[PDB]
Design an enzyme around this catalytic site. Sequence first.
Site: not given
Ligand SMILES: Cc1ncc(COP(=O)(O)O)c(C=O)c1O
Ligand SMILES: *Cc1c(COP(=O)(O)O)cnc(C)c1O
Lengths: 372, 377, 372, 377
Positions: C195, C46, C98, C170
């Site tokens: 895209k 993460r 968008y 964007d």
């Molecule tokens: C009980 C619990 N909830 C939530 C999380 C968070 O998940 P992630 O690391 O996928 O964001 C953890 C991670 O350690 C956890 O043990």
């Molecule tokens: C399609 C588009 C998005 C959204 O992207 P997602 O991957 O669908 O969340 C945002 N901005 C523009 C300009 C787009 O064309």
Amino acid sequence: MRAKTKLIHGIRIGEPSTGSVNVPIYQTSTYKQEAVGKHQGYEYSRTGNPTRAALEEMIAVLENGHAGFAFGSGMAAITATIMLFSKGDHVILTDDVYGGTYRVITKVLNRFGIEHTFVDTTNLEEVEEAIRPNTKAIYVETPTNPLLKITDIKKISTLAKEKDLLTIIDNTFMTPYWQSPISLGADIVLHSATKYLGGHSDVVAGLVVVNSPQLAEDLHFVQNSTGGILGPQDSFLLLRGLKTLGIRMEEHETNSRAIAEFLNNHPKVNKVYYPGLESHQNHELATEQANGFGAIISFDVDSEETLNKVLEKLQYFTLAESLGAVESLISIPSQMTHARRKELGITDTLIRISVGIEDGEDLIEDLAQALA
Amino acid sequence: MRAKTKLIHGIRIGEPSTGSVNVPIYQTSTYKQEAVGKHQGYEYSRTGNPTRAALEEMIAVLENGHAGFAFGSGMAAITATIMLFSKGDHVILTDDVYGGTYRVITKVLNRFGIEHTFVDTTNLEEVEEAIRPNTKAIYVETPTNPLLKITDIKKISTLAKEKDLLTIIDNTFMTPYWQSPISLGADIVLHSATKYLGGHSDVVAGLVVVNSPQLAEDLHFVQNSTGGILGPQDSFLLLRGLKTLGIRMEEHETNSRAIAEFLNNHPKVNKVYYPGLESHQNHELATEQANGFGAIISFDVDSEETLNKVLEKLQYFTLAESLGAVESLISIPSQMTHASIPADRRKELGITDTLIRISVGIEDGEDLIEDLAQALA
Amino acid sequence: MRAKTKLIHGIRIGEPSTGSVNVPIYQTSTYKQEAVGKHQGYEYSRTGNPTRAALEEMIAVLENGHAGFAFGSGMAAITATIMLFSKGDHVILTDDVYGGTYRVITKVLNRFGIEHTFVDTTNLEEVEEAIRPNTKAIYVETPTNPLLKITDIKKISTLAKEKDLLTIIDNTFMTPYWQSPISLGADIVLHSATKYLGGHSDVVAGLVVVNSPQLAEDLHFVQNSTGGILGPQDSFLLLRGLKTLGIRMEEHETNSRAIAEFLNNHPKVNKVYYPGLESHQNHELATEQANGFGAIISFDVDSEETLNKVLEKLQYFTLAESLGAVESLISIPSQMTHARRKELGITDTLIRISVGIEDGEDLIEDLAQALA
Amino acid sequence: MRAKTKLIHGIRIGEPSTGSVNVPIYQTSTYKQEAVGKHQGYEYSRTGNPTRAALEEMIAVLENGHAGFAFGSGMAAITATIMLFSKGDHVILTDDVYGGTYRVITKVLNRFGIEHTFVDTTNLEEVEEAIRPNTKAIYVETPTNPLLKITDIKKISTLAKEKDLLTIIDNTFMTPYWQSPISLGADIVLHSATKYLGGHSDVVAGLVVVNSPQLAEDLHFVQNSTGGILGPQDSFLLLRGLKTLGIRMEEHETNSRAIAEFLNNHPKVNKVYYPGLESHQNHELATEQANGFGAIISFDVDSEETLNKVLEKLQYFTLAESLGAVESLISIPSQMTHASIPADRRKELGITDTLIRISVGIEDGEDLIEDLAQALA
Ligand SMILES: Cc1ncc(COP(=O)(O)O)c(C=O)c1O
Ligand SMILES: *Cc1c(COP(=O)(O)O)cnc(C)c1O
Ligand SMILES: Cc1ncc(COP(=O)(O)O)c(C=O)c1O
Ligand SMILES: *Cc1c(COP(=O)(O)O)cnc(C)c1O
């Protein structure tokens, strides 16, 4: 370390560069060399790929062998192994090997001058009588697909070694977890990793382990030259599968013994094949050369109308090819296994089930209601 | 459809289940059957997998062929193809075929009773007087690795059909975008899809296209029986790469013509192999049977010290085996591919140990020429 | 290095451990530590993942920015960026952003006390008049989806900097290949990588590049805390996509100019939106702040019956959501873009096409036959 | 269906297109529509992807819920769930919630007007007198990380329903195999699928299950609008892991009860946290609301030198963050998770800097006990 531990720690956990507790997926064909022939480790993914190499090391460690090799299927593993031999060489095979092995021996490798004899490998006298001057190898599948006939790996190996022959064992049904062919004298052990080793019906793969540096050089040359390799995404999914092999086979075992017992005591079922029944030819040998009876059951129901009605009523067995998966599978070898069928004793009322890790009680009740 | 449109609409966009504009990845071994033998076209992934089926159809389309077959490598594709033959069959091959091909013919398939003669396939007389009564096919690689020697596919095919022989063409270097061997009369065309077709140095794969139902039944039988199949993830990545094969080869071509001209006029370069030079053997044929020259150039530098300076100094060519990637690659055939052959026949097929092979990527052309220029002076 | 070269060599080719010319797919959640807090590089996927990190570095290099961040979608990229701000902060946005940005600003982030004004960012006087005391940022999309209105990035940036505001751009439609917002004063540039950047309709992803160490710490904290990350398989496919961005956008460009020219001179088409037409509002600015006009065309046909008949007859444009793909797409914004529609000038006879890398001639002929 | 069968047949085996016994991987952004608004259920992958749809259905099934939602992480799942609320809403949370949860509540969502009170959720009186008129939900994590403190889900739910509050349960440590919060009256249950559900240390993912159509419309709106979705490859790997969740937790349980008993009787271990010890606070509750104790054990060793010897010597426990993997993992909360909190409240919730957390894998039980034994003496 005990077997359950080896499935988790057979290879070094912690990839050198980042400490990843998993093997990275090397989705790559080639490798930058520092100088002409001096990025040593890896050069070209056909020859070697780090994800495939971890897998090849793992299967060698699990069968206690010298080197492992990963192929695009069980049949590519089987074909590369027989292609160790040449025009004029002879192979003896278990008479009721898998239909795919039957087909490649009789319809492909025959055209290349590899000669064969199919023999009842339960009869060691008939095996010895089949040896020709040009014989190089005895090939044994135990238990067999789908009648589960048991062959004595130690006696076949001792006869082979006395007569200067290699012993090749298809250990697909038992897995390395239940049976150790190299420990019983086998030179080559091979797997349709498509079945229990992957375990989730989602990879087609073959593995070969050899017991000698000479065989590792010779099989490597064949794998690198003919190139039937397993890609790194499939190699990763197979490594992932291996992690739960022990706990899967233990649950398979518990479910399958109870199912063989119930099927063997049923009015509509007049014969049951399963190594764990005392009535099964060589049950005693089955308890001696392997630590489990496995999770494949073949049973002969009383009539076509019983079979048909079993197929349409079963809730947890899926009508499909293949086996070794966490989900229960059912096939009719008489209508689904083409590649002597009569001679082998494959009745038109014979059903093969691959027993899954569903609750054993749900699977019995499902078979009961299906034959009620 | 023009060529560039075919690479995009060669197969139906919108799979029947959900309308996905992409082929789904069928990471699966098996299929539920409704009844024993009723199954919606798939029963076991080794025999047929729908992701692999889309790729096999796509390459069949691009080569104007009957059916396609996907293997785990170029070598599996060549092996499966030569295994259509049996002990006491004879194949004639191009004499400077790819090393891996040389090895499978001479160290593997010789042990299975398959006989061979290596011939200069640029000489239709010599091809003809290699034909024995047990000959079944002529195998041609055009252009060749690494000297890019050119073989008349249409002439070979017509000789072959006249002697009831199959014509097999390794079309790896040209791709289906530049050269169409089945159109010129080939029965079988194959690819190391590891190169241009994948195009991103990230898939090992082989493809075979056949132009008859009998060859489709026979090669399918070999594929299914011996099982050297490409898996679904690789199949998907190869389909993906196929999408940009046209625009990749157009960019490859522009960089390569300019680098081939650049190197051919440089004072430290004695000889340049590239089908696009008017001075290259059968340049005229190259321009007739293909719509492009390749993106592979071999050049003989003046000395060992030059060779070592260019390996030392190039910034945008990576030293590595393989070719046909978006990133530029360099190899020394004498030390990396043709180390096997003796120095004896390496003066015959003129493979000096100052010969450099470059695979021209899709970097800025002017960056790659500047890079070669600084490295060489 | 020139732009085409940077797409291939923006990051080091040759992964340290094996020399792989590709980034390995680190399909892993965690990393073995040598000592308590001393496998430094990577700790938890993460927080950081080596495949995602290569991608984050690549997009920073391509926009010439300080740091890159990879999110599970464009909308996750847009949401993490606005979540830099707090209850009581105000954002000014291009009035025809968008629909997804429109929706998250008005239906999600409004509930969190983030205030907005939608403004014609083509009118710099109206942009300045929209500035409140609690204003923190001006958010600009150029060209816009789907009317392709062009906003002056350099003039918006200069006004923002004078009034202590961040500039967020964007750059989805132009890609880093055609337009460089950071070079024109932008603090934050963001992409629906779904895209053009992926380019093959097969990944949903968002990317953000920031121009400062402070913004990189603040966006990293949001990405790590709220966790809308891009997984490593998607990161790998996106890196692969980026490799062909230059040659794709060049072919897109060639095809789209010829199509805008033909559509703009057609009896059944009474208006065409495309930056490369001299008639287009701010065509001159379009040629100045970007090196290409892009591959999105919106055109107003004469009647409902023309539209319907275009849809059912087009052979190479697929009726689908999204854009930026190697294959041509068609949508009807009036029936497919919900989230003022009337005010913006989105007619019920307006068609948007995403021009692919099919042969430009096949695409013209296909549009002709469709309007014949 | 029994529990073990549900993990395999929870959703139909055999996808409608080909009969594949596996969910295909839909590596795709978009879908061809027949006509403007006619599409076979999929239009854009952020809104719905069929691989993600199978996983969202599966986890909804296993938790006896209305609908499931897949996010790119546990943190995205918690964030999306708390974003159902608006500025001036109040949530009551378990006081020793997971660090990442603490951080999103106190450093992110506080800036968006969402108010909180941390409470000892083991004390239903204290929970009740934290309820303000702007309170909308009570958020409970049982057992907690790392002291495995137990909260009566059925009592919290009934208090909540009585005050028109939503009950949200983080069911990560127990999984759907051992604990069924919706059955005990929860409205919302979520998971770091990164842990047990994936089970192979190889997917970062979050899951949320809701038990009403109104909550399904609202959370889907957040998912689609803010877009913290799980991709199709991760969705597939998580489905795959779910298949062995039952047999993994049975093996985890057997190793953990034996290691918890082993450590509780060792002379270098002062205190052991594990719901399965009869001496653990609310052991009786643990045995009523769940069918297993976990595979997480924290234990207070006798000294700094012991701590360092066990980190030094263990062969089968890998030092790493995360838990719920088939491979055994060890962490020191004081230096790795609860480094943030001061030493002040680390004696309150008794987090010594000799507290070790182990996540017990599915290695041989006797190997893991032997490994702890050698490391500790
Ligand atoms: C009980 C619990 N909830 C939530 C999380 C968070 O998940 P992630 O690391 O996928 O964001 C953890 C991670 O350690 C956890 O043990
Ligand atoms: C399609 C588009 C998005 C959204 O992207 P997602 O991957 O669908 O969340 C945002 N901005 C523009 C300009 C787009 O064309
Ligand atoms: C022309 C040609 N054919 C075949 C091959 C072999 O393919 P692979 O490496 O995928 O086995 C190559 C590889 O270099 C090649 O260049
Ligand atoms: C299924 C099977 C094979 C063939 O494996 P593939 O992966 O299908 O090539 C070989 N041997 C045995 C015993 C099998 O059960």
